[PDB]
mmCIF file of C-alpha atoms and ligand atoms in Angstrom:
data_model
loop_
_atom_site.group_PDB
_atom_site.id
_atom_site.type_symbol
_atom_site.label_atom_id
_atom_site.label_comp_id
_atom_site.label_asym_id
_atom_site.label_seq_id
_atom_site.Cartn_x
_atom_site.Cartn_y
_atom_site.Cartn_z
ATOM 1 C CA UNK A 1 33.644 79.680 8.815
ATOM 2 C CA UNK A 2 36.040 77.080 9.858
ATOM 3 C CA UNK A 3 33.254 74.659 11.372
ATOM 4 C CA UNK A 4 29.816 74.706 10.141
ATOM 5 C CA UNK A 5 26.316 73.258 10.836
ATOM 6 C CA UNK A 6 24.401 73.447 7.940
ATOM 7 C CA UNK A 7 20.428 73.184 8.550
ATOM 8 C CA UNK A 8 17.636 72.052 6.219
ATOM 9 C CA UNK A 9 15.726 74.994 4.452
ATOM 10 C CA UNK A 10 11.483 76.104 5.805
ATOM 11 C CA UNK A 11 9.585 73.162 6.391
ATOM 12 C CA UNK A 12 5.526 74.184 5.560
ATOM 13 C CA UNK A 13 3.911 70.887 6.682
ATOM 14 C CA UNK A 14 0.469 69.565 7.261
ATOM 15 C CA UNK A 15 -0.991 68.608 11.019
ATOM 16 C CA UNK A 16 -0.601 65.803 11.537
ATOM 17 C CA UNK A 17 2.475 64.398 9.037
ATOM 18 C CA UNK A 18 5.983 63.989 10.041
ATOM 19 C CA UNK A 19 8.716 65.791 9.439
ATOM 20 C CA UNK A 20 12.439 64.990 9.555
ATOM 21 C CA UNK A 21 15.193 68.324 9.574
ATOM 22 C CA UNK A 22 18.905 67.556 8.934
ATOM 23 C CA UNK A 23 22.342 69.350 10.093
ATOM 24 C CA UNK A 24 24.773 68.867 8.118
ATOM 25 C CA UNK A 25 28.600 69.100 10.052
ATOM 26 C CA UNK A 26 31.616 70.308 8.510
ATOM 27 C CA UNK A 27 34.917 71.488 9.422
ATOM 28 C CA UNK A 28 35.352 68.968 12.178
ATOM 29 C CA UNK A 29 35.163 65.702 13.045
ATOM 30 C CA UNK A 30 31.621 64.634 13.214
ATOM 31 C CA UNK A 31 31.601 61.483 15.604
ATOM 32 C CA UNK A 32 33.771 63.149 17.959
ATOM 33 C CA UNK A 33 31.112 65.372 19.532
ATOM 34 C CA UNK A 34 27.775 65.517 20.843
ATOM 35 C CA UNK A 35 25.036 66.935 18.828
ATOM 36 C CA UNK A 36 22.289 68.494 21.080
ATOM 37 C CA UNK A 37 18.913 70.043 19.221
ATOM 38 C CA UNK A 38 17.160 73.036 20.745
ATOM 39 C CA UNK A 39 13.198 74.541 20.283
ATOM 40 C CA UNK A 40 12.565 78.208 20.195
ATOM 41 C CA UNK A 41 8.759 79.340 20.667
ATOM 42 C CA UNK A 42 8.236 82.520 18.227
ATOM 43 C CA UNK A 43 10.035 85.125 21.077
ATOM 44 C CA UNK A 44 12.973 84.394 23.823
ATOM 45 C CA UNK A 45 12.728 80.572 24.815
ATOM 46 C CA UNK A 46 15.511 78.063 24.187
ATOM 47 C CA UNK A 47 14.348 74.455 25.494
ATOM 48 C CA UNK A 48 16.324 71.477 25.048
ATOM 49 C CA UNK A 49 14.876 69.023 22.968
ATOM 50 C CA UNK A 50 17.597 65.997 23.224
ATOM 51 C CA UNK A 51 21.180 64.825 22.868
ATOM 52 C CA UNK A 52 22.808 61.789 20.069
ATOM 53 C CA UNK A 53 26.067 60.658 20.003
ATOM 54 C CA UNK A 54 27.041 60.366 16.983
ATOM 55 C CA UNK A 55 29.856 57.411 17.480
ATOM 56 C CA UNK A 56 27.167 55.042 18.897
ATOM 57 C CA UNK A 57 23.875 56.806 18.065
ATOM 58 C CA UNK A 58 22.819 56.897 21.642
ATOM 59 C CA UNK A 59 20.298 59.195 22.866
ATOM 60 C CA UNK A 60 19.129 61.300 25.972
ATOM 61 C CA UNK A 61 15.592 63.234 25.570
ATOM 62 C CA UNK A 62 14.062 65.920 27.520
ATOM 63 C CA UNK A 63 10.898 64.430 29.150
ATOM 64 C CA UNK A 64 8.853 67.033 27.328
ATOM 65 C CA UNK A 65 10.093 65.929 24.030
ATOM 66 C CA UNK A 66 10.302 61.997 24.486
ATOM 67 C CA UNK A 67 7.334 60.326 22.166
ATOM 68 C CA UNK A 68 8.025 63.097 19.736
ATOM 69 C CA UNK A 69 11.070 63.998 18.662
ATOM 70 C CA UNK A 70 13.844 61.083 17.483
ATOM 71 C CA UNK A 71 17.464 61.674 16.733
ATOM 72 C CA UNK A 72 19.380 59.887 14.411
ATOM 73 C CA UNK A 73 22.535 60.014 12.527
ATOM 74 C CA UNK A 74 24.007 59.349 8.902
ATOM 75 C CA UNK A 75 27.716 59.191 9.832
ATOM 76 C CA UNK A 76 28.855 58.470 6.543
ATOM 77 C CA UNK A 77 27.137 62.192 5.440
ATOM 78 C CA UNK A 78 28.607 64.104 8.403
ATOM 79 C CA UNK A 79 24.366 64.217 8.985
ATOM 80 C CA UNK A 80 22.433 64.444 12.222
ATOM 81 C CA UNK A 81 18.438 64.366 11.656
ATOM 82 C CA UNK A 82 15.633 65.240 14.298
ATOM 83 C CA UNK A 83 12.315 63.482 13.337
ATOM 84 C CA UNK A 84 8.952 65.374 14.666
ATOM 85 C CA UNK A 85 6.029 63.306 14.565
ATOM 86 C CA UNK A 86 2.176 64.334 14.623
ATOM 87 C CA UNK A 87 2.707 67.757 14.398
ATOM 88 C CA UNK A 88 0.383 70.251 15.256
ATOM 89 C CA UNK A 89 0.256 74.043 15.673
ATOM 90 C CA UNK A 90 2.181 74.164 18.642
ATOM 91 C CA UNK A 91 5.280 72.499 17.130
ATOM 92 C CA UNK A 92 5.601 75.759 15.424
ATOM 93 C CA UNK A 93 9.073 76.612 15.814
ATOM 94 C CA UNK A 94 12.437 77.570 15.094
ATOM 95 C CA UNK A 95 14.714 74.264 15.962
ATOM 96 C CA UNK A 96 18.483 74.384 15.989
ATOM 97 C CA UNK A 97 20.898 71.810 15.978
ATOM 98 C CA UNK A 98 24.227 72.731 18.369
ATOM 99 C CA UNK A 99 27.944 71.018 18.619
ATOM 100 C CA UNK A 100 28.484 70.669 22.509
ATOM 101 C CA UNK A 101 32.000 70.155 23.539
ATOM 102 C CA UNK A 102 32.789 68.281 26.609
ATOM 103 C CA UNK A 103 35.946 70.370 28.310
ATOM 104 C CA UNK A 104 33.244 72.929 28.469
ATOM 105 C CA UNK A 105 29.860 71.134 28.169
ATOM 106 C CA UNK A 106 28.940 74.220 26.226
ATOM 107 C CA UNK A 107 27.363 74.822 22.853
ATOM 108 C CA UNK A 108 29.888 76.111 20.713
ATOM 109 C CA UNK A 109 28.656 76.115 17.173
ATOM 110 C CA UNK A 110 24.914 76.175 16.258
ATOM 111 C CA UNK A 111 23.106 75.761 13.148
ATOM 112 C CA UNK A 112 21.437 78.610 11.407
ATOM 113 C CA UNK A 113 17.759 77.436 12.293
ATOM 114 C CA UNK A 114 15.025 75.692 10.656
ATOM 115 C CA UNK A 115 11.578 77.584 10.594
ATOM 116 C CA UNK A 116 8.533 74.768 11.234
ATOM 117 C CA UNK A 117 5.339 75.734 9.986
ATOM 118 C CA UNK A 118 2.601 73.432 10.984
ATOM 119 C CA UNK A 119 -0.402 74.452 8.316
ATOM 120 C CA UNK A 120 -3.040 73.231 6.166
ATOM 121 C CA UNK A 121 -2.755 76.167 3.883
ATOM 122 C CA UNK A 122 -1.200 76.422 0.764
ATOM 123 C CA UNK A 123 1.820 78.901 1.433
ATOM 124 C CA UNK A 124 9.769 70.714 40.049
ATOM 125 C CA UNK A 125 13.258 68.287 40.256
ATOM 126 C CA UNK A 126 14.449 70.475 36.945
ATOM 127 C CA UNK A 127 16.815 73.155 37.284
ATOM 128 C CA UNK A 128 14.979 76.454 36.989
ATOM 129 C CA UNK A 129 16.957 79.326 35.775
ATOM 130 C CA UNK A 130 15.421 82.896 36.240
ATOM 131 C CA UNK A 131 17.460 85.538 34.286
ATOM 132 C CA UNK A 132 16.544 89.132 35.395
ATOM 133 C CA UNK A 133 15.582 91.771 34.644
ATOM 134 C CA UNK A 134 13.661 90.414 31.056
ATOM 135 C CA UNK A 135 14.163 93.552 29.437
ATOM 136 C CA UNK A 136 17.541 96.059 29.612
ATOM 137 C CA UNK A 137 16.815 99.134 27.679
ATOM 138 C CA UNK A 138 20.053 101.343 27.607
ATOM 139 C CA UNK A 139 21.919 104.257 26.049
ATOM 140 C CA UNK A 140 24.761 103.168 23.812
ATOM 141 C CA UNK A 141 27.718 103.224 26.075
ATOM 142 C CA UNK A 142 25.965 101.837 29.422
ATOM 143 C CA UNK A 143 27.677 99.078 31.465
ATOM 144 C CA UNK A 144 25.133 95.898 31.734
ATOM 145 C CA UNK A 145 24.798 94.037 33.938
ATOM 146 C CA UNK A 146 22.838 90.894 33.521
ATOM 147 C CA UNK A 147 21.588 88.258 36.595
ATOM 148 C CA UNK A 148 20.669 84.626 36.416
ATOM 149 C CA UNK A 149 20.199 82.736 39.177
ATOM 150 C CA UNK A 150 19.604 78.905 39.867
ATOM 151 C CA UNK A 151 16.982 76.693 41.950
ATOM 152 C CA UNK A 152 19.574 74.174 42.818
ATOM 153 C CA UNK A 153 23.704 74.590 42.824
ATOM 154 C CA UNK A 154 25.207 74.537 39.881
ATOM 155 C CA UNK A 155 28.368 73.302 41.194
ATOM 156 C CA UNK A 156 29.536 69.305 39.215
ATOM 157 C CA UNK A 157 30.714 66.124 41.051
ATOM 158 C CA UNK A 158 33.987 67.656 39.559
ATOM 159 C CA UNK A 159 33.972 70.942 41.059
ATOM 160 C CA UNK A 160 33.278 72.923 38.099
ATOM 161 C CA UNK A 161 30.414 75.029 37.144
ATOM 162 C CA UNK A 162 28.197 74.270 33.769
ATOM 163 C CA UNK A 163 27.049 78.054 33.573
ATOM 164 C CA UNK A 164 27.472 79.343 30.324
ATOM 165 C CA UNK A 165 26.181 82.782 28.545
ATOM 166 C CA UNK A 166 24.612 83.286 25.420
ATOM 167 C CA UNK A 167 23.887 85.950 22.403
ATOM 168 C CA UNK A 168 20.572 85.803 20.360
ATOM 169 C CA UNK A 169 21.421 88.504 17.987
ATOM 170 C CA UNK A 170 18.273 89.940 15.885
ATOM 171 C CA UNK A 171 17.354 87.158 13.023
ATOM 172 C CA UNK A 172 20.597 84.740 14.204
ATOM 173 C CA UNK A 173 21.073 81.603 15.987
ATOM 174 C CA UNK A 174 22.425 82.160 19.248
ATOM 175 C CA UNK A 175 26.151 81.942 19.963
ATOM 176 C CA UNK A 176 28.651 81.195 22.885
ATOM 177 C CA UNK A 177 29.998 83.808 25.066
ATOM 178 C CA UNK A 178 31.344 82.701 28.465
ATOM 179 C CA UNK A 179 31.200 79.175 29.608
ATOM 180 C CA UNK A 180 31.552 77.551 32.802
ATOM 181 C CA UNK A 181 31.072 81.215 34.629
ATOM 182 C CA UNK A 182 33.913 83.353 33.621
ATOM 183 C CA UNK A 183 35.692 81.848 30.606
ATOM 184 C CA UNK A 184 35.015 84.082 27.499
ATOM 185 C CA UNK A 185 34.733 81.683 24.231
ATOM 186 C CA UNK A 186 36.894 82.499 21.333
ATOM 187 C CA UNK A 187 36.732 85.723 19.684
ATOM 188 C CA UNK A 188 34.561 87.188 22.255
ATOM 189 C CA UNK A 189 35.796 90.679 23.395
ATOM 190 C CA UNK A 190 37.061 91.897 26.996
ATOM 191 C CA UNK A 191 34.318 94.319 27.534
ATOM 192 C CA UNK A 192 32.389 90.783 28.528
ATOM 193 C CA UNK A 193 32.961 89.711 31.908
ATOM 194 C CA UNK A 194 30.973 86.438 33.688
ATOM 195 C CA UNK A 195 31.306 86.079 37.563
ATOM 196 C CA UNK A 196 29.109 84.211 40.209
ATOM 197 C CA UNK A 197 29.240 80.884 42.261
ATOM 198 C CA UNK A 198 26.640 78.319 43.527
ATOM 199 C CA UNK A 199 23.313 79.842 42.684
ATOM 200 C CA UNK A 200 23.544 83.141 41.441
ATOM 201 C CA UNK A 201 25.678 84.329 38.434
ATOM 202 C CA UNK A 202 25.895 87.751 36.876
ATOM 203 C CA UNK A 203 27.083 88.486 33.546
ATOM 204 C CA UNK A 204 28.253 92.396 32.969
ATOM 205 C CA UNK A 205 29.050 94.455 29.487
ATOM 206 C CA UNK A 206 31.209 97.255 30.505
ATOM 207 C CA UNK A 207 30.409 99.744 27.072
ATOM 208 C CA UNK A 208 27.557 98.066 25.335
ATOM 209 C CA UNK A 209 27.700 98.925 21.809
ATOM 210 C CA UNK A 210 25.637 97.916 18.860
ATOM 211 C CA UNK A 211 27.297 94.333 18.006
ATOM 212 C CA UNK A 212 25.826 93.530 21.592
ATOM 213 C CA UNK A 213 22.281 94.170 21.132
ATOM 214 C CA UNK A 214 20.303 91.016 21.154
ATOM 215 C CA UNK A 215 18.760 88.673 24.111
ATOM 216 C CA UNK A 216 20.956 86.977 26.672
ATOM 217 C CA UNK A 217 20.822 83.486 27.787
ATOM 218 C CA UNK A 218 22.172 81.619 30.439
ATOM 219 C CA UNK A 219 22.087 78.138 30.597
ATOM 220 C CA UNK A 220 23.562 75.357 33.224
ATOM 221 C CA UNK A 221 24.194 71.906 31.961
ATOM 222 C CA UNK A 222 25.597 70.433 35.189
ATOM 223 C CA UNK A 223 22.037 68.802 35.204
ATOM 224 C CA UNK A 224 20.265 66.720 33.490
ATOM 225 C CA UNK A 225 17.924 68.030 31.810
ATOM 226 C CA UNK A 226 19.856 70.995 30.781
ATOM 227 C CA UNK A 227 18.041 74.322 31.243
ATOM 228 C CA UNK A 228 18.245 77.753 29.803
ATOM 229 C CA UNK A 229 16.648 81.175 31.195
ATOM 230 C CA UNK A 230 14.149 82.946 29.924
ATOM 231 C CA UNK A 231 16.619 85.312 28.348
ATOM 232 C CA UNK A 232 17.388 89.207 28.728
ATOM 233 C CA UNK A 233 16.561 91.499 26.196
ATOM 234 C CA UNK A 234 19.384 94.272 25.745
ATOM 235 C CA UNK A 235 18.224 97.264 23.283
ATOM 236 C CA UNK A 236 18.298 100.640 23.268
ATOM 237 C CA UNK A 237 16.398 103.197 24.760
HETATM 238 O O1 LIG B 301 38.275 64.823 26.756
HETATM 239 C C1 LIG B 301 37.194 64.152 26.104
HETATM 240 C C2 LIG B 301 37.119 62.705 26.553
HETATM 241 O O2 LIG B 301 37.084 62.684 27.984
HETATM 242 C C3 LIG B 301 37.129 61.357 28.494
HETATM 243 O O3 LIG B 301 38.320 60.680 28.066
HETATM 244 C C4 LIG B 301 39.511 61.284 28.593
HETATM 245 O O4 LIG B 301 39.545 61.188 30.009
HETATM 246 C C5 LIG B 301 39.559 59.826 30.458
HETATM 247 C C6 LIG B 301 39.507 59.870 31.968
HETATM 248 O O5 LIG B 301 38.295 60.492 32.384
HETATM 249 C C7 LIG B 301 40.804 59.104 29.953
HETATM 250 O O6 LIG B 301 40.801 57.732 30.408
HETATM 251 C C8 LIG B 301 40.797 59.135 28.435
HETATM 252 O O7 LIG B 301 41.985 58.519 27.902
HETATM 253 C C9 LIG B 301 40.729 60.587 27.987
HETATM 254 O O8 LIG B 301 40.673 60.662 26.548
HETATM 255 C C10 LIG B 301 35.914 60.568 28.002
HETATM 256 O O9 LIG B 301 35.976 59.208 28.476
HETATM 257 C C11 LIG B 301 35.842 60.577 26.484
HETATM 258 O O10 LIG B 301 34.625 59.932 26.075
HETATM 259 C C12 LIG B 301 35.890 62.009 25.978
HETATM 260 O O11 LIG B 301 35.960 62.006 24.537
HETATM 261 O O1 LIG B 302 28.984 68.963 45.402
HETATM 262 C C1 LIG B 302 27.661 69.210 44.941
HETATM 263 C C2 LIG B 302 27.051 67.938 44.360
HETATM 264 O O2 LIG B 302 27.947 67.418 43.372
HETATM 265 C C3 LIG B 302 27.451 66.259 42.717
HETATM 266 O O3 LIG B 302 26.181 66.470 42.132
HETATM 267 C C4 LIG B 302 26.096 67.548 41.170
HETATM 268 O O4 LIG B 302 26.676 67.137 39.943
HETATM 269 C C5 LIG B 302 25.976 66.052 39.315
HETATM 270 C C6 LIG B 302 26.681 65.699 38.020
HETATM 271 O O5 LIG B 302 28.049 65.321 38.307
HETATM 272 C C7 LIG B 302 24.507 66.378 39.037
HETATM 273 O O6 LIG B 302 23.817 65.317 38.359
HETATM 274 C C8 LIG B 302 23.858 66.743 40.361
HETATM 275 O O7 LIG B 302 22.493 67.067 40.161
HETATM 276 C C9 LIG B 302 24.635 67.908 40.957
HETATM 277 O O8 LIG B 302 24.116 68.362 42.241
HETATM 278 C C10 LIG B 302 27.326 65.119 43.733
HETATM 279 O O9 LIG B 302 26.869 63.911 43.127
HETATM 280 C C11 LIG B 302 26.323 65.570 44.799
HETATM 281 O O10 LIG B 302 26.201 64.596 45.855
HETATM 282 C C12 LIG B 302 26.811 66.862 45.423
HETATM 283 O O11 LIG B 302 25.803 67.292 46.328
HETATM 284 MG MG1 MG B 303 40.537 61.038 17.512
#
């Protein structure tokens, strides 16, 4: 489209060895926004791996991830990198690199994935964010409605609220829906609607229809580190 993240193809790598994944940026300006890289486990996890800056190449790392992960940039290439070091099974992954803007502090353009395969074969002061129910079977034409709830106020120093909503649809990177509660991101239709305050936030679908099916996240970056729930699975009966 318009703006574009562009990640590195399957990486099949040996325990052990390094590996570096790139996302390339196009259609806007690169040093003008954060890039933030993101983990998914095989299933409905999202875990923040770490921030850069491109203008500066300054860094912020989830705990969890500092020691193994290390951002860098290329700004002459438009290029952010994430280096993973002594892999193992577990880093087994899809990772995503994601623009975040900073009117929103949401993640507005992702990268299509890179699939990590870690082989030797040939071929409690964090947020918490529980998202129920885990599973939402309905019949085509249901209204949804989708809970997530914090462990701490989500509420900024500048009296805003960093909840934001997002759509996992089968085999895609996720993608922005409503940010900071109630404000639906471009392109995103009215049948969404995001309400909630302090702690507890509820997303609802008025019709669902097929374009909707996928799992839900929500995810609060008025903290540090940012957090996402453990998504919501909306299918069919
Ligand atoms: O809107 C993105 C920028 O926000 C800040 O800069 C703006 O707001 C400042 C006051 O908080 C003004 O002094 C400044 O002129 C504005 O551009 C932030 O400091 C920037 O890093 C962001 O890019
Ligand atoms: O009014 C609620 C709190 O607002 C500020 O703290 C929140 O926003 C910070 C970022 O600006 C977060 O780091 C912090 O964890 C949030 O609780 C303010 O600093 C707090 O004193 C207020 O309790
Ligand atoms: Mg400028």
């Amino acid at each position: 489209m318009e703006i574009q993240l562009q990640q590195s193809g399957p990486e099949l790598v040996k325990p052990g060895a390094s590996v570096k994944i790139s996302c390339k940026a196009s259609g806007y300006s690169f040093t003008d926004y954060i890039m933030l890289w993101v983990k998914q486990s095989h299933g409905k996890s999202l875990e923040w791996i770490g921030n850069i800056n491109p203008y500066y190449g300054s860094t912020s790392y989830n705990l969890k991830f500092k020691g193994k992960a290390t951002l860098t940039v290329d700004k002459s290439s438009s290029t952010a990198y994430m280096q993973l070091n002594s892999l193992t099974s577990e880093d087994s992954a899809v990772y995503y690199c994601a623009r975040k803007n900073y009117y929103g502090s949401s993640l507005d353009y992702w990268g299509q994935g890179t699939t990590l395969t870690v082989s030797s074969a040939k071929t409690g002061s964090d947020v918490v964010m529980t998202q129920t129910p885990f599973s939402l079977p309905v019949s085509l034409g249901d209204q949804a409605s989708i809970s997530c709830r914090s462990s701490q106020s989500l509420v900024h120093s500048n009296g805003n609220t960093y909840l934001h909503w997002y759509l996992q649809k089968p085999g895609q990177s996720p993608k922005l829906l409503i940010y900071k509660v109630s404000n639906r991101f471009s392109g995103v239709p009215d049948r969404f609607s995001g309400s909630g305050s302090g702690t507890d936030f509820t997303l609802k679908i008025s019709r669902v229809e097929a374009e909707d099916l996928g799992v839900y996240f929500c995810s609060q970056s008025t903290h540090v580190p940012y957090t996402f729930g453990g998504g919501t699975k909306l299918e069919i009966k």
